[PDB]
Amino acid sequence: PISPIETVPVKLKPGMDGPKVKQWPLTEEKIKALVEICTEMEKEGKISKIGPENPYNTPVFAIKKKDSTKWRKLVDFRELNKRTQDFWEVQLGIPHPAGLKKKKSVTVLDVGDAYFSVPLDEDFRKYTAFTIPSINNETPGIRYQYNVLPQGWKGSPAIFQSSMTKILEPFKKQNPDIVIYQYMDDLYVGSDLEIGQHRTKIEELRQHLLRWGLTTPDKKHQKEPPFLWMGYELHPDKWTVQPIVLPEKDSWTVNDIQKLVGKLNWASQIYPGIKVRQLSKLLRGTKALTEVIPLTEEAELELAENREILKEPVHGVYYDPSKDLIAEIQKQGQGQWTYQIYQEPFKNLKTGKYARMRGAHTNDVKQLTEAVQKITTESIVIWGKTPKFKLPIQKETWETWWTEYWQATWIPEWEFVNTPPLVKLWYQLEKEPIVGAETFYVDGAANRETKLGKAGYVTNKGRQKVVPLTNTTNQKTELQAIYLALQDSGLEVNIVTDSQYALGIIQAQPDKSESELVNQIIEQLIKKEKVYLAWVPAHKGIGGNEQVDKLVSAG
Ligand X SMILES: O=c1[nH]c2sc(Cc3ccccc3)cc2c(=O)n1O
Footprint on this chain of Mn ion (rule: CB under 5 A)? 443, 498, 549
Instruction: Give the alpha-carbon dihedral of 141, 19, 289, 258, to 10 degrees.
Output: -140
> Is there a contact between 216 and 131 (Cβ–Cβ < 8 Å)?
no
Residue from 59, 509, 549, 551 touching ligand X (CB under 6 A): that is 549
When asked if residue 88 is in the footprint of another protein (CB under 8 A), the reply is: yes
Residue from 76, 364, 443, 546 touching ligand X (CB under 6 A): that is 443
> Is 478 assigned to a binding site?
yes
Residue from 248, 410, 448, 470 touching another protein (CB under 8 A): that is 410
What is the smallest separation between the CB atom of 534 and Mn ion, expressed in angstroms?
13
Closest listed residue to residue 220, CA positions, set 295, 141, 109, 313: 109
> Is there a contact between 336 and 353 (Cβ–Cβ < 8 Å)?
yes
Nearer to another protein, 170 or 384 (CB): 384
Residue from 66, 284, 311, 539 touching ligand X (CB under 6 A): that is 539
Phi and psi at residue 199, to the nearest 5°: -55, -40
Q: What 3-state class would DSSP assign to 77?
A: coil
Alpha-carbon 282 to chain mean position? 18
What is the smallest separation between the CB atom of 431 and ligand X, expressed in angstroms?
24
Residue 539, contacted partner among ligand X, Mn ion, another protein, none, CB below 5-8 A by kind: ligand X
Closest listed residue to residue 247, CA positions, set 233, 232, 262: 262
Residue from 216, 499, 513, 524 touching ligand X (CB under 6 A): that is 499
When asked if residue 554 is in the footprint of ligand X (CB under 6 A), the reply is: no
Residue from 200, 207, 296, 460 touching another protein (CB under 8 A): that is 460
Alpha-carbon 155 to chain mean position? 23
- Please report which helix (H) or strand (E) contains residue 292, including its range: strand 292-293
| Candidate segments 212-220, 379-387, 390-398, 510-518, binder of another protein by CB under 8 A | 379-387
Q: Please report, as residue ranges, which positions from 493 to 552 form the binding site for another protein (by CB under 8 A).
A: 494, 496, 500, 504, 507-508, 532, 534-537, 540-544, 547
Count of C-beta atoms within a 10 Å radius of residue 225: 12
When asked if residue 8 is in the footprint of another protein (CB under 8 A), the reply is: yes
When asked if residue 546 is in the footprint of ligand X (CB under 6 A), the reply is: no
Query: Which residue number places its CB atom closest to Mn ion?
Result: 549
Residue from 71, 87, 171, 416 touching another protein (CB under 8 A): that is 87
Helix/strand/coil percent split, the chain, to 5: 35, 25, 45
When asked if residue 391 is in the footprint of another protein (CB under 8 A), the reply is: no
What does the alpha-carbon distance between residue 509 and residue 240 come to, in Å, rounded to a whole number? 43
Nearer to another protein, 288 or 434 (CB): 434
- Pairing label, strands 326-333, 314-316: unpaired
Contact letters for another protein, residues 222-261 (x by CB under 8 A): ----------------------------------------
DSSP state of 433: P
Query: Which residue number places its CB atom closest to ligand X?
Result: 538
Nearer to Mn ion, 498 or 511 (CB): 498
Q: What 3-state class would DSSP assign to 464?
A: strand
Angle ∠(485,488,491) on CA atoms, nearest 5: 95
- What does the radius of gyration of the chain's CA atoms come to, in whole angstroms? 33
> Is 320 assigned to a binding site?
no
Q: Please report, as residue ranges, which positions from 127 to 166 form the binding site for another protein (by CB under 8 A).
A: 158-159, 161-162, 165
Q: Please report, as residue ranges, which positions from 417 to 446 form the binding site for another protein (by CB under 8 A).
A: 433-436, 438-439, 441
Question: Residue 544 half-sphere exposure, CB side, CA atoms within 13 Å?
Answer: 22
Residue 87, contacted partner among another protein, ligand X, Mn ion, none, CB below 5-8 A by kind: another protein
What is the smallest separation between the CB atom of 469 and Mn ion, expressed in angstroms?
14
Nearer to ligand X, 97 or 453 (CB): 453
What does the alpha-carbon distance between residue 541 and residue 408 come to, in Å, rounded to a whole number? 35
- Please report which helix (H) or strand (E) contains residue 49, including its range: strand 47-49
- Please report which helix (H) or strand (E) contains residue 362, including its range: strand 361-362
- Please report which helix (H) or strand (E) contains residue 241, including its range: strand 239-241
Phi and psi at residue 79, to the nearest 5°: -70, -45
What is the smallest separation between the CB atom of 533 and ligand X, expressed in angstroms?
15
Residue from 17, 40, 89, 324 touching another protein (CB under 8 A): that is 89
Interacting residue ranges for ligand X, rule: CB under 6 A = 443, 445, 498-499, 538-539, 549
Q: Give the annotated binding-site residues for Mg(2+).
A: 110, 185-186, 443, 478, 498, 549
